[model samples]
Target: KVFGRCELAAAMKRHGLDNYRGYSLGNWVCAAKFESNFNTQATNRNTDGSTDYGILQINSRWWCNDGRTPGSRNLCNIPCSALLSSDITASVNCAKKIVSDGNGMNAWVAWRNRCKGTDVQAWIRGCRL
Candidate 1:
């Protein structure tokens, strides 16, 4: 499922991502856009043999267990496949774990490079919170 920017904002907010760990709903929305373009089935295999999955691109290394990422911590206690589901509940849960794990939103390089220190509110503009 590919979500429109406003829809994605609503979904993340519905899942309690809004202002979680000091990051706004627009921050999450912007990160999702840069990371996966709001596509639920998105996957990106890293050069280090880890893969990122779903709308937020949760990585296999420390988050979801892919059964193939060597030395995976699987902190989210979920299969990587769960992150790909159209329903973003699992994805949002894993993302919360990521932010709460002392990494903040820096866990996602895309977020740091694109969404951080920017006017992320633009990502959610005109979208009724």
Candidate 2:
């Protein structure tokens, strides 16, 4: 149900983007397909109810089990992949940037798999604002 263009856009915006300039629809669709099955609020486990995470696959326990800034829930207390979660965005963006440094879409493909799309911008065309 969440595997649509809108969902992709929300995911992109959640991560901070307006138009998915570099990535494509297929890339986004693929990412959604792989990440959370389109569930904006998705959750899963390691076959042991050990994790209550998002489709983006962010684990709150490991990333922000502790509130940020000496007892500030603003940065914590929410799912690690929520749009307002700047702290969580840092983690995902850091990973994305680390892999797609200079090579552009090719780099995304190399690290994130063929789902990065075929064209240069196909890798982020579905990103929303």
Candidate 3:
């Protein structure tokens, strides 16, 4: 469910992600844009042979189990497919768990690689959430 930018921003706000884990809403939006382009079903194979899932592109090695991604620790206690759906509730919850562990947005490669030191304001420009 890759919706419009503002739409996803609204959803993130509604889901308590606007300021989740003390990270800025712009960080969330910008990271999502670079990670999965706001697509819930987005999946990318990592260099480590793991896979990233959902808008946050959570990794299978630590967050969920995709079966094909061998040796996953399933730290989030969720099925990988649960994150790859239009309803981002599960994905958001798992992402919160990751953030709660003190990693912050550093847990996401996209955040460090793209959203960091960038003008994230453009990601949530008109949402006004």
Q: Best-fitting candidate, measured by TM-score?
A: 1
| Per-prediction TM-score to the true structure, in the order listed | 0.97, 0.41, 0.93
Error of 2 at 65 (Å): 3.5
Q: Cα-based RMSD of the predictions, in order?
A: 0.8, 7.7, 1.2
lDDT of each: 0.92, 0.45, 0.87
Q: Could you arrange the candidates by TM-score from highest to lowest?
A: 1, 3, 2
Q: Kindly give the stretch of ten consecutive residues in candidate 3 with the minimal lDDT sum.
A: 120-129
Residue 79 of model 2 has an lDDT of 41
Residue 83 lDDT (model 1): 96
Worst 10 residues of 1 by lDDT: 94-103
Please give, for residues 1-129, the per-residue lDDT of candidate 1 as tens digits. Answer: 999999989989999999998898889999999999999999999999999999999989889899999887889999999999989999999888888987799988999999899999999999987
Q: Please provide, for model 2 over 43-122, each residue's C-alpha lDDT reduced to its tens digit, 9 standing for 90 to 100.
A: 55434323434434544333333232233222234444452232335434533543354655343332267454245355
CA error at residue 92 for candidate 1, angstroms: 0.4
Clashes of 3: 0
lDDT of 3 by residue, 13-70 (tens): 8898877877878899888888888899998999999999999999998889988777
Ranking by lDDT: 1, 3, 2
